Structures are given as structure tokens and as C-alpha cells.
Amino acid sequence: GAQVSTQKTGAHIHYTNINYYKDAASNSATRQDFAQDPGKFTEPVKDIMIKSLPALN
Amino acid sequence: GAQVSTQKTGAHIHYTNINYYKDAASNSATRQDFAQDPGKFTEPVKDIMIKSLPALN
Amino acid sequence: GLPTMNTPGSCQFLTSDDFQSPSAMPQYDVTPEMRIPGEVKNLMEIAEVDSVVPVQNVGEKVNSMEAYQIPVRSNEGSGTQVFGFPLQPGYSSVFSRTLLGEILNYYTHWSGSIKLTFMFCGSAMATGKFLLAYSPLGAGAPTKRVDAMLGTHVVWDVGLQSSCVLCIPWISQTHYRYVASDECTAGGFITCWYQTNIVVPADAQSSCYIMCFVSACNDFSVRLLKDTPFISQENFFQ
Amino acid sequence: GLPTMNTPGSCQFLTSDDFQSPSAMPQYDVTPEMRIPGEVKNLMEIAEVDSVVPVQNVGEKVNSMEAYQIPVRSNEGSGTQVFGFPLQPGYSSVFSRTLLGEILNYYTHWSGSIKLTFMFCGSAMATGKFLLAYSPLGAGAPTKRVDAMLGTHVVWDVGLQSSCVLCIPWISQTHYRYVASDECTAGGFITCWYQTNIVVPADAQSSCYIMCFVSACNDFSVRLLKDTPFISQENFFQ
Amino acid sequence: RVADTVGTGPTNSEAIPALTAAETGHTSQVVPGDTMQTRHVKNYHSRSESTVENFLCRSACVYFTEYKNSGSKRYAEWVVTTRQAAQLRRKLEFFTYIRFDLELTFVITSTQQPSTTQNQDAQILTHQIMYVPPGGPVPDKVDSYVWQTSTNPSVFWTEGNAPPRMSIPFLSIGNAYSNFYDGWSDFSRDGVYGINTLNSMGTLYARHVNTGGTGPIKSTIRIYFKPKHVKAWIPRPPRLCQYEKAKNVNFQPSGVTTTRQSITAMTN
Amino acid sequence: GYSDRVRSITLGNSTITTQECANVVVGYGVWPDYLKDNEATAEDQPTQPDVATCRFYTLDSVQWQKTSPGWWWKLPDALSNLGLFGQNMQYHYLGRTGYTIHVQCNASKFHQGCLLVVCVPEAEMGCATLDNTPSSAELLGGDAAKEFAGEPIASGSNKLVQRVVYNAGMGIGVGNLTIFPHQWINLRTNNSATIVMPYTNSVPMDNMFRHNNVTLMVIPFVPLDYCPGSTTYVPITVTIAPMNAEYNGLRLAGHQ
Amino acid sequence: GYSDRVRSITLGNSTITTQECANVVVGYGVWPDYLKDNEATAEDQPTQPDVATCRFYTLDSVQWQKTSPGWWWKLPDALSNLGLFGQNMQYHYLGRTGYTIHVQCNASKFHQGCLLVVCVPEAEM
Numbered sequence A, B: 001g002a003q004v005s006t007q008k009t010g011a012h013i014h015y016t017n018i019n020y021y022k023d024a025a026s027n028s029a030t031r032q033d034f035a036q037d038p039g040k041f042t043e044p045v046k047d048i049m050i051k052s053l054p055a056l057n
Numbered sequence C, D: 001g002l003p004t005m006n007t008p009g010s011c012q013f014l015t016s017d018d019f020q021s022p023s024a025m026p027q028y029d030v031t032p033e034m035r036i037p038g039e040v041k042n043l044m045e046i047a048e049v050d051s052v053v054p055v056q057n058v059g060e061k062v063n064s065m066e067a068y069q070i071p072v073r074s075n076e077g078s079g080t081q082v083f084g085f086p087l088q089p090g091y092s093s094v095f096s097r098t099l100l101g102e103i104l105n106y107y108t109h110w111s112g113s114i115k116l117t118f119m120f121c122g123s124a125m126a127t128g129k130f131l132l133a134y135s136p137l138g139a140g141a142p143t144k145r146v147d148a149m150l151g152t153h154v155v156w157d158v159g160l161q162s163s164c165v166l167c168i169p170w171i172s173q174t175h176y177r178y179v180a181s182d183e184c185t186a187g188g189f190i191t192c193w194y195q196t197n198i199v200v201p202a203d204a205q206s207s208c209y210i211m212c213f214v215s216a217c218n219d220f221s222v223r224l225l226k227d228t229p230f231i232s233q234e235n236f237f238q
Numbered sequence E: 001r002v003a004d005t006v007g008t009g010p011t012n013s014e015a016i017p018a019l020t021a022a023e024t025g026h027t028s029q030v031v032p033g034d035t036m037q038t039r040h041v042k043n044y045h046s047r048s049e050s051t052v053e054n055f056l057c058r059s060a061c062v063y064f065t066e067y068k069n070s071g072s073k074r075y076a077e078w079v080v081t082t083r084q085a086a087q088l089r090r091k092l093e094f095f096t097y098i099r100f101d102l103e104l105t106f107v108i109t110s111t112q113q114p115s116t117t118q119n120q121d122a123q124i125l126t127h128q129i130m131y132v133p134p135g136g137p138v139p140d141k142v143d144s145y146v147w148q149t150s151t152n153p154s155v156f157w158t159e160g161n162a163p164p165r166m167s168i169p170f171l172s173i174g175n176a177y178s179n180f181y182d183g184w185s186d187f188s189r190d191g192v193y194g195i196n197t198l199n200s201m202g203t204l205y206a207r208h209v210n211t212g213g214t215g216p217i218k219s220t221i222r223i224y225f226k227p228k229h230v231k232a233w234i235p236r237p238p239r240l241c242q243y244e245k246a247k248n249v250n251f252q253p254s255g256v257t258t259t260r261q262s263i264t265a266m267t268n
Numbered sequence F: 001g002y003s004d005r006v007r008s009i010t011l012g013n014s015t016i017t018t019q020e021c022a023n024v025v026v027g028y029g030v031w032p033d034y035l036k037d038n039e040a041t042a043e044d045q046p047t048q049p050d051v052a053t054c055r056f057y058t059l060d061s062v063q064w065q066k067t068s069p070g071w072w073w074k075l076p077d078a079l080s081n082l083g084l085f086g087q088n089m090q091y092h093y094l095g096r097t098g099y100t101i102h103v104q105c106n107a108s109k110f111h112q113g114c115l116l117v118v119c120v121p122e123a124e125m126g127c128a129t130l131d132n133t134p135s136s137a138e139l140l141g142g143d144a145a146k147e148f149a150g151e152p153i154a155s156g157s158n159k160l161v162q163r164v165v166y167n168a169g170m171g172i173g174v175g176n177l178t179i180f181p182h183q184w185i186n187l188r189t190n191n192s193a194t195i196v197m198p199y200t201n202s203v204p205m206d207n208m209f210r211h212n213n214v215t216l217m218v219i220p221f222v223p224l225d226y227c228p229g230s231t232t233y234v235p236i237t238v239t240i241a242p243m244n245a246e247y248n249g250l251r252l253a254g255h256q
Numbered sequence G: 001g002y003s004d005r006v007r008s009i010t011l012g013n014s015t016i017t018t019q020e021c022a023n024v025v026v027g028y029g030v031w032p033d034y035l036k037d038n039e040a041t042a043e044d045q046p047t048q049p050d051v052a053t054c055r056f057y058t059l060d061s062v063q064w065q066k067t068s069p070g071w072w073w074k075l076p077d078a079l080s081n082l083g084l085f086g087q088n089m090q091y092h093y094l095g096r097t098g099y100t101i102h103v104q105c106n107a108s109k110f111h112q113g114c115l116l117v118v119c120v121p122e123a124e125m
């Protein structure tokens, strides 16, 4: 059961990976996980604030 | 004749295995055989006993 | 010749490794299998079976069969404590040598409930009521019956069925408690009290005995298997 | 036995290498995951959060909480300069210890805009107007308010909202500017001036303070991760 | 992919993007275009090195110890702790809670030690590393039964080839590793206080399997840690201080930052 | 119409009303909630005292002086002897709860000062002596505020928390306390700060007496200062309300 | 099969098991229940400690002598300093609750005695 994935390349090409162990802890790291969400740390406050309105009214 | 099986992972992912020998005694151990039955050692007695009835009547 | 790279750790020996190696004898014809009773697939099933507990493990008592027996007698005042032992099965002296404890000495982490079974061994005429209690960690061990009653407990009556089961609920912040004693996780305190004085007719013995049996419940589990502390050899045996 | 060739570099150890190796323990059952607040997926998200700036980092001021405070007072003549600091976050003393600067000390290249936030901390009655300006590289640092106005600037008024944001546009010939100071790429000069004299009623203090907050904008990015300069050990700790 | 700036044109308006309140604690989020006229620019920049996994997926040497083929100190024992190396400790400290698989590489180098003995002949040394879980019996001497390792994971290495490598599953009683614990070992609160209370990862033992030659040989074993499959939560500020012990966070007091000559001056 | 500044919070039989406030902050965007059955390690049913435990509790006020390094409170210790909530934890081995924090300071328009109200998970203070861990009495103050010291603790060979303000006791820069959830009280713009915290911990439930989850800290970045004849005493009051409090492991009272 | 005499009552974390018992008596044929909204005088929401308050509590035993006139207990006073239930009433101005009573005496077949266990509303001494 071979898996085909994209490679890390520049902008302005696939690598085959096969698991040979069943421990699942013997796999490679998940380097390609480019997801971010600053909503927790920034804009923590309950009532939402618009970009251009008086902050306190 | 490749065989695809699941890996050992946590809860709340497949490994390929190919046999290269015919002796059959050269294979890997069967670690993933999670079957249990305490009925032999516990509740050995012929007449079945219910969880909440007087044990002797 | 396909090009190949060598990974770090090539030509190394790991005790717990699973690989394919060539048989010493080719095409051996193995002897046919036959039906055998009591087949075993899991260690836990052996731990589920009850094991006698040497509760009175003091001095000469371990040397005699008196270790297993727990003394009880008719007494002037109700509320005296029959016995007290640590909750954990693995480290405590009382549960260390039992079936479940011996299996645990093999594994680093343990999880789930323990069933304790108590069988009265007195005359038919003898009658009595005892209070068996488990107290949750972080509270000093109960020193009186009133304190013990606050901890979850089962009141037992002698007569009719002659055995009782106190089931200790798992109450741990952690999913797994170390078999080795841990300051972070304290299993609990288990103690027994007289709910009422033992009563006997004239010509019947005042003092009787109570045996204790300890086993793994259905929820029980283990992890991180390790070498056992008890077995050691100075030299290879002959 | 398939024929195989060995590549150059076989049996070598690379710190940053990604390969498959056999587990020390076979089939371990890992503890189940549970929900935790403030989960982190990217370092940049931490840099977006504002960090207090020790703008007055001179002498005794770093030892007291006076480092963060910037002094302001009513003055006879308008046009005096409140403060001046280097644009780059990584090398400059003023931004080196801040959240964004500390993350940058870890990475060799940095890219994108910086948001600077200024909050007046004076009495309600106190009023004033200040001019916050950024001057593009290759021009000597502004020495007068007229020179500063030529560089892009935001005129701020105290009262109503008590905080202002000066956003520094990225203006670099290169896509990436080195975190380490580079002769080739000079980030810029950031300076503040009095647009008008601070005015206060009798019984209100003439002198107030202004705190500064520094953060990565949405366009900000980093590359070539490297060991940080600040952390060092003479010996392993015990 | 990094967000790309939008082109803007001059306008006079009631709306006030630059004006905001620090008191709310909601970080201001304003683009360069709101403050000044800008031009439409496309960005191909990628936030692909800031990911927590990329930042923490590199081998670092946590600790090294020395043992001798002859003399009193036959074997070396090290308790397994992340804290004793500053670089590994500082990056782990960046998150309060971390969950991660561990990759272990051991590098062993043997140096001949000068001696009075002559015409020495040296067969290739073989080195054994054995890891013991809490409560496993410790070896008391190099020739002990403990060295059989029937119930203990163990690796044997022959000098002159690739360093031995193993993968470790996430081992914790807890759902996640705790970088900082604000707690006492006991209910009373009289006792050791710190992360050391949650410290029970076991111990590692290294010995010469065999002695090739009469002369004394000293072997250094270096242990390397590489986080894998990383998961983080509750991020913490940068430490900002030199470390002092691996059992506590005790610190000599430190100035906030390096000091420039004047507030106006651009020179550090 | 309505005002963003005006607010009214009602918990149990206690209601809080401030004419002026900065927008309320939820620290990780998560409201406090009762524990899931899927995530629950303990078999025994939990006991939920509901409104009894979940009410505002007012602590002893402190005096803001022109030279006060800082004031800090260990929150679990703060409510350890207050009402039914103090009684329930003493009775029970395991407790998990959300916490509502409300810090109120009142000053004249002429007054000028800025206080930083930050709640930090797992803050570990470090002892002034390197070879000794900090004492429990120094670490936690019951019924009384513990105060930061502007100067570093002097050389010593005894247990003593290191209180220098810039390190904040954690040996980390004071300015970077922004990453922890926080709310700024500026006398010209804000009357009081409200922070709501989701329960945070690796374990689902933990014994409250042995372990403290979060620590409320107040530090003035800008010193209080006023012209002569103005009120010279300023009072800061901390009110804390438990949220969705639940208890397990019914046990005899007291800790040892 | 089953026995009328054997019984097992489980309340909170306390379980009571007697091999021999007379049939259980409900005094007026009414099970204890929480108060109805239709019948409730007080506007404020009530607090229900659930299992904490609702568990068996064991009192100090007495000695039955050949000449003991009698023993009597005021039940609300009996549990006034016992566990969370003693704490809740001390904290709260109004409390209404059902009560389970279990009186246990053990004797040899040869022994002979008869005890009357009666609960009386509003007894005024």
C-alpha cells in the first residue's frame, strides 16, 4: 500500500513513502502541517470588535 | 503477494509485510492477537450462576 | 546493483525487535497439534482468578498457615478495627505475593478496580455484622468507625450467604497508577470495623476467623512490561 | 540476494534527518488524548501577540519597571523629540528581549511589516498631539521634525481612544532582511516628535508616560532556523 | 502561504482603523494599507519553518557520561532528564504542555588511556546499553544478573559502524508532559516542591560487554533527543535567564535588557 | 440605546455592575464547561453543588501606593476557606472548576496609573537560595495578599520566594506576560478588569490542596501619582466566582 | 430463586445488606419526593447536594441490658454534625428532607427479646 505525496518545492515532484513497521511510533515526522489560527491568543475577548470602529463606545 | 495490515496506534496508518522465506518458521511473531476468555478459569462450575441470586438455594 | 543508503543503527542488536531470519533446518515437518484443556491467551485472565491474601503477615504467622487467617472474637464494645491494609496490590507487603500482585511486579503501570472477597469461617450458630470500608487518597487513614463510614463502605451480615464482596472503585486523577510506590499517586486505605458485636450460644466458640481473596476486575489493565524484582540468581544453576 | 550499491555518506549521522527506526517497545498502548485550551500549531501566532517594549533601556532603568515607561512632559517649545530606536526587531537592544525579538533570535532571515502600539498613561484632563515617523534606509536619521515629516508618519491625538497604531511598511530591495545586523540591508530609523505642546489644567500633573507594544503583522515570515545567542551553559545543570 | 497586501487609495472618512484600545487586551489587527496608500503585491512566502514540529525536529545532545573497562567504575548510570541541557530545556519551556514521540541516537567513542603496561593487543570492544523502568532491580556490580535483560529493553553495539537508533512511544501517566508543575509531592505541602515531583522516566546503564586489551580504556556515551509527532498547548514566555539547577527554576535576578547610551540614540 | 462600557454579570445570588469596563476577555476563547464522559477517568458519579459553589466571593482589599512593587494571589488557596466552596474541596479528594476574576479600582479624573491584571497557568516561583525550594507559607497566602519586592531578595540560606518584580518570581521578563491572558486597567480609560478562564490542566481532575492551577498577579507598569489634596488612599478589590464547579472522591475532612 | 427475608439497599456510596429482615415499611404509603413548584412558597432557586447529603450515616451503638427502660434519638439533631449534610444545614436557613431509618440488632438463637422501633411526627416531651 504505497502512499504518493507532494514534495517541498519553490513557487513562481512527488515522493513515495512506505511504512515497514506496525508500532506506528516508528513513522517519520509530519513536517508538512502548515495550519495556523491566531484567534485564541489575539482577539481573545467575547464581544467581536470591527477593524475601524471606536474600540470603546 | 504483499499483505497490508493496520498499525498499533492510540485512540481518541498501515504497514506492508512480505515473506521472503518458505520455512514458515522464519516469519515474525503474531503480536496483534488480542483475544481473551476467562470462562475456563473463572465460573468453572457446571450449573450457571446469575450475578444477583442467592449462591446456594 | 540498485543504489542504497545505510540508516544509522545498522548492525545493532535490540532485545525487543521483530524481523525475518533464515531457519537452521529447511522444510522441517512439525509434530501435529492436539486439543489441550485450560488454553491461555491473556495474562489478565489469570489475574481475574481470586488469590488467598496473607493479611496477618506479622512475625511467625507467615511461617505458619496463620498468615491467611484474620482473627475475630466476641468483644465487650462495638467499633473495634478488625484490620487495615494499603490499597495498592503491587508494592504493599500484604498483596505483593498474591496471583495479581506477582503479575503486577512484572508490569510498570496498573489501571482499574479491585474486588476483595471475605468468607466467614465460624460455627453455624455464630452471627455478626462487620463494616468494610475504602477511603480515598489525601485523607489521613480513618482512626474511628465514624471516620471510616464517611469513606465508601459495604455493611456485611453473617448467615445466609457466608461470603461478601467489597469492590473498590478506581478514583485516580491519572489514567494509570505506578506499580512501584509513587508519592504523586497514593492508592487509598482499606480498613474493617465491627458494625455489631459477634454473638454466640453457650457451647459455641467465641472466636472465629475470616479469609480474604483479591482479584482483578473487568476494567483492570497493565503497561510498560518490566523485569520482576523477586527472582535473582548469584550463578547459573546446574 | 538482489545486487545493491552503497551511496557515499552511508552510516553517517545528520542532526536534521527524517527516517524510520524500530520502536524500543512493541505495540505500546499510548494514554488517550484530552481537550486542552490554547493549542499551538505555529510560532508566528505567538509573535503576533503584542509585547511590552523596554524603550528606556538606559542604566538603572532596566533594573526598575521604568525601562518600559517613556517619559513625556509639558514643554515651552513644540518640536522636541520624545524618543528614537532602530527599525530591526532582532539586533536592536530595545526589541531584542521582546516576544517577537526572542523568536527572531532563533531564525537567520526575517520578512514583512511590524505594528507598533502606543498607549497614553496620563490623567483624563491631560491632552496632547505627537508625530510618530518611520524613515526609509540610506537617509541619515532625521534630526528635526520637518525632516521626520518627509518620512511616512501618523499624527496621533490624545483623548477619545487612548491608543494609536503606527504600522511600518516593509520597504526592502531584498525579499528577506538578516536578523543579524547586515551592512547591505539597513531596516530604517523610527522616531517620535511633539506635534503640539502637552496641555494640563491646574491640579493635574505636567508629566505623564507612554508605553510601547511591538508585534508581527499578517505578512511577517521567517527562515533558516538557527541556535539562539542568549542561552549558554558552562556545565550540565543538576 | 503568507497573506498578500491589498492596494489602497487616499480617502477622508469617519472610520478610524489606526485608533484602538490597549485596555480591552484584543491585539490591534491593522494592515499597512489602512495607515498609508499601498500597491497590490502578491506574496509567495510560506510559513513552513515556524511550525512547531519543524522547530523541535532536530537532534540535540541531552547528556554524556564516561565508564572504564578496568578499575572501580566499570559501568555508567544516568537518570533520564530533558532539563540538564540548556538548549533542549529552553525550547521545551516555550510550551507549558507538550505531547511528543522520542527518537534516541547513542554515539559511543573509546579513547586509549596512557599506562605502564606494554605490547597491548586490543580486540574490538562491544558496548551494552540497558534501560530500567521504575522499580526494576538496579545492577550493583558489572557482572550482575540484572545485565541479562530478559524483561528489559537493551541494545548491543560493535565499534566501527552506524550509531544504534530506537523510537519511543509517548510515555506518560498524564495525557500530556508538564514542563512546569506548581505543586507539592504530598497533601501536607511540607516536602520537595517542583516539576521533579512528576519525574519518573526510569534510568539508563552503559557497560563494556568485553575487554580487548590489558591497558585502561575510557568510553564516552552521548545521548541525543529528537521530538516527533509534536503537539503543543498553553504557550509560555521566553525564559530570559541562565539556568542554575535541573530540579528547580531557581534563578539569580537578571536586568530586563542590554542598555543603550540614551533614549534618542540608535546605537546599542 | 446601549453602551459598550456598561456591564452586568449575575452568578448565583451575587450581581456585579460597573458603569465603565474594558471588553471582557475569555483567555483561550473557551467558556468553562463540565467534564465530558468520553474524557472522564473516574467511574464514581460526581457531586455538583451548583449555585452554592458558583457565586462571587470578595477578598481583602489592598492599598495602591506610589511605590508598590506588586500584589499576587494563588487563586485556589484564596477560596480555600470561603463558604460551601471551601467546605466541599476540604471534604473531596478531586475537584475541577472554571474561575471568574473581577479586579476593581476607583480613582479621580486627576489621578494617573496603569495596572496589569494577568492570570498565568502553572506559574512556579523560584526560591532566593538556589539549593533550597521555596517554602509553602511564602508560596501561598490564605486570606491575605502576597507582595512582590522591588529589590531582589538579599543573600540568604533559608527558604524564601524570589520576589523581584521584573522577573515576577518566574525568572521571565515582565513585559512578555502579554502571551498569558490579561486585561489592562488605565485610570483615565478603565474602571475594572473581567477575565473568564476555561479549566486548564493535563489531568481531567486534580486534588486542589496539593496542586494550584492558575495564579492571579497585579503589577503597576506606571506608578500611581496625584497632585496634593487628592484622595491619597486608593483601594484595589479582587472578587472571584467559581464556574461549573464539580467534586469527586468523598473523603474525611483535612489534608495530610 | 429469591427470599423475602434477604434485602439490599444502595444509597450514594453506602450499601446495606441483611440476610434476614421484616418487610420494609413506608409509613403513609408515600415515597419521599422533592417539593412541587405549585406548592413552593420561596422564589429563590434551591440547591440540591444530591449524593453527598443522600448517603447512610452510622450513629454510636448502645448496649441492650436486661433492665433498659428505653433509648430515643431526635433525628434532625442526630445528623446535625455529620459530613456535608451537617455542613449544608448549618450554612442554610431552610431545609426539607426525607429520612431512611435502619435499626440492626444481632443475637444467638437461644437469646429472646422484642424491641419496638417507632418514628413519631411532632413528639413533644
Ligand SMILES: CCCCCCCCCCCCCCCC(=O)O
Residues within 6 Å of the ligand: D024, E080, E081, E082, E102, E104, E129, E130, E131, E153, E154, E155, E166, E168, E171, E177, E178, E199, E201, E202
Ligand atoms: C532502550 C534505551 C532507551 C530508553 C528510553 C526510555 C524512555 C525515555 C523517555 C523520556 C521522555 C522525556 C519527556 C520530556 C521530559 C519529561 O516529561 O520528563
